[PDB]
Design a binder for this molecule. Structure first.
Ligand SMILES: *C(=O)O[C]1[C][C][C][C][C]C2=C1N(*)=N[N]2
Ligand code: NA
Ligand code: NA
Ligand code: NA
Ligand code: NA
Ligand code: NA
Ligand code: NA
Lengths: 224, 224
């Protein structure tokens, strides 16, 4: 089934077209995913020049099918079950006391490559807030992503709070509301309530002159 | 209490002297540990020219006191409880269809630095096997380290299986038997059965001419 497509290392392509407060930008990422170890490694470039938002605000938008599900929880892995045809992932991300992102993404195999293609629209951001003011630290906390089935849509929902460290010591909260639905008509696994535990390390490539992000991520399912 | 020594970041020194089938070597490592996040960052160099075994085979030998124990599991953290006087860590590592490593290490504070000082002896290795023939991939899988109390020694025991990917697509198993005993006479915490979930990334420094390994590790306790 879909899980068989993830037994080894899978190439990943990420494409994002964004508009935040009228600032239009694009990001391209390339790397690999190793779901057996729940591991992602990717490098992202802003292909339009300077990114108009902080890189950390785009991490969650920029492939949960790479999560490591323990053997006893494999029947709850919706993400792999939807492959290779894939799924649509939609979110609203509400930054507390600031703007909102709305995103729609399709995650699917194109041959041997797992592709995540995303449209993002951001509105109502404060000009000198933490986002457009670039006041967020270049780091990423560990989170729990809470997943529940959405039987009526043959999919899932998720809700979680991202904590972005601010340079002044405060924390910028980003509330995430997520829904995923299969692209194909084949059967998928609808899960019992559980969560994904995430760990992320953001870095730079010292030889890279373009605006970019190097990302390492480990993600593991738990709670059943 | 020993756990208080591990707030923030702590410098780490690792020193290993090894002899495998008569091939002698030394390794020195330096870096830092952040127990609050279960995170380790280290760089190791062979100070005796070419390392005669693959770097991945030494990862487990080259500081479980840096593991993140969740708040509900803090009474099960033997490793920190033994600090600053430290503990002895001894292992037998049996490579399937190949030789054995015998290790003895002392892990303790020396001033501000957490030091792991190790002696390693390897015997019965095949000259053209996966180890002495350098047939192992430069990578590392995620593992669970199963821990139980060893009340008879006022310590702990652990057992786990390391899976080393081989260049021909096979997996080289390394069975690990471990015992740890406190160096000092103060009280320690003896745990209920649990495990450490380990995640490791190996890399190279492009400008480093010595034989070396850069390691990033996340370790979290679980199972209770
Ligand atoms: C962070 O990596 O979490 C750990 C162990 C705690 C629960 C998540 C299970 C998991 C990890 N590593 N692999 N799976
Ligand atoms: Na603006
Ligand atoms: Na703000
Ligand atoms: Na703030
Ligand atoms: Na990197
Ligand atoms: Na550790
Ligand atoms: Na491999």
């Amino acid at each position: 089934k879909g899980e068989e497509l993830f037994t080894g290392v899978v190439p990943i392509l990420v494409e994002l077209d964004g508009d935040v407060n009228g600032h239009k930008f694009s990001v391209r990422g390339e790397g690999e995913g190793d779901a057996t170890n729940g591991k992602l490694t990717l490098k992202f470039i802003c292909t339009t020049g300077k990114l108009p938002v902080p890189w950390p605000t785009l991490v969650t938008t920029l492939v949960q099918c790479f999560s490591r599900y323990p053997d006893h929880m494999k029947r709850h892995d919706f993400f792999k079950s939807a492959m290779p045809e894939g799924y649509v992932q939609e979110r609203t991300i509400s930054f507390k006391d600031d703007g909102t992102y709305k995103t729609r993404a399709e995650v699917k195999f194109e041959g041997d490559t797992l592709v995540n293609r995303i449209e993002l629209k951001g509105i109502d951001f404060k000009e000198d807030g933490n986002i457009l003011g670039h006041k967020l630290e270049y780091n990423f906390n560990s989170h729990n992503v809470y997943i529940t089935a959405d039987k009526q849509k043959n999919g899932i929902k998720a809700n979680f709070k991202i904590r972005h460290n601010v340079e002044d010591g405060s924390v910028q909260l980003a509330d995430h509301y997520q829904q995923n639905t299969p692209i194909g008509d084949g059967p998928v696994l609808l899960p019992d309530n559980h969560y994904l535990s995430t760990k992320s390390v953001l870095s730079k490539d010292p030889n890279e002159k373009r605006d970019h992000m190097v990302l390492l991520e480990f993600v593991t399912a738990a709670g059943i």
